[PDB]
Design a protein around this ligand. Structure first.
Ligand SMILES: CC(C)(Sc1ccc(CCN(CCCCC2CCCCC2)C(=O)NC2CCCCC2)cc1)C(=O)O
Lengths: 11, 255
């Protein structure tokens, strides 16, 4: 549901 | 290692934000291009922004791009806060979701004075009056932020204070929908503890500065609550004001 932010967090 | 939790957070602040208070005050003292009317806005768009609608819609799009970048810097800053990368990914997301704009409006104070705000990486300066001159609803976005900033800046914080304050904002244990509340509250407890000791040392002449700052965190929560209401209005009533995806994620279901 927060796709981009979840992406940012795992980098 | 309390003195090193502070230094770790400060270092992460200097590493991750392009703009900070010492840089802004150097520029705001002694030259940014002043944007104070329609003519100067157009000239500024020619020289500071690469790639046609109402002035207000172009300003809104530039602001969005900026917020997309600040949200990105704040995420990197958050990952460098001790303990944050250990939380549940859902709680990481929930903490940034509700935290970023509280952090953004705190840091916005650093580039604001009562006449205007420093923008575009230090290279422009938009007057408060010009922003008031815009048509509704866009003349309502920035003003409450200037009002907050004038009260905030009167506390005379520096970047070492602000970095801890922003860490404390992000590590808030009462956001809607946190799964592991106790783990977040324990993190926040340590950051706030370090903030209290740091203010006591860095500002030994303001004996109430710590509770003054706690109150500013509640003020920023109300400020973001109202801001999200103005954005929802904009998103219904303005055909040309769509949100960048990352910003839609952040605002969806916020308040
Ligand atoms: C976009 C919404 C929907 S409303 C909103 C939110 C935030 C802001 C402040 C954006 N801004 C002016 C960006 C000014 C750009 C300038 C305009 C004139 C022509 C040249 C370019 C700026 O300098 N922000 C700082 C960045 C450094 C760190 C602190 C914050 C304005 C509106 C959102 O809420 O995201």
């Amino acid at each position: 549901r927060h796709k981009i932010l979840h992406r940012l967090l795992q980098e | 290692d309390l003195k090193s939790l502070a230094k770790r957070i400060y270092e992460a602040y200097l590493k991750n934000f392009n703009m900070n208070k010492v840089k802004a005050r150097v520029i705001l003292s002694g030259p940014p291009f002043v944007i104070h009317d329609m003519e100067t806005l157009c000239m500024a768009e020619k020289t500071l922004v690469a790639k046609n609608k109402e002035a207000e819609v172009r300003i809104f799009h530039c602001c969005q791009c900026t917020s997309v970048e600040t949200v990105t810097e704040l995420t990197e800053f958050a990952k460098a806060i001790p303990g944050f990368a250990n939380l549940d990914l859902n709680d990481q997301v929930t903490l940034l979701k509700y935290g970023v704009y509280e952090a953004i409006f705190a840091m916005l104070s650093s580039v604001m004075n009562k006449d205007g705000m420093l923008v575009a990486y230090g290279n422009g300066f938009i007057t408060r009056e010009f922003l008031k001159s815009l048509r509704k609803p866009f003349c309502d976005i920035m003003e409450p932020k200037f009002d907050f900033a004038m009260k905030f800046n009167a506390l005379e914080l520096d970047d070492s204070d602000i970095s801890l304050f922003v860490a404390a904002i992000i590590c808030c244990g009462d956001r809607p929908g946190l799964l592991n509340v106790g783990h977040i509250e324990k993190m926040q407890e340590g950051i706030v503890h370090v903030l209290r000791l740091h203010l006591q040392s860095n500002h030994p002449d303001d004996i109430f500065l710590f509770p003054k700052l706690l109150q500013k965190m509640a003020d920023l929560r109300q400020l973001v609550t109202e801001h999200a209401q103005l954005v929802q209005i904009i998103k219904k009533t303005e055909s040309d004001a769509a949100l960048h995806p990352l910003l839609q994620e952040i605002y969806r279901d916020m308040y």
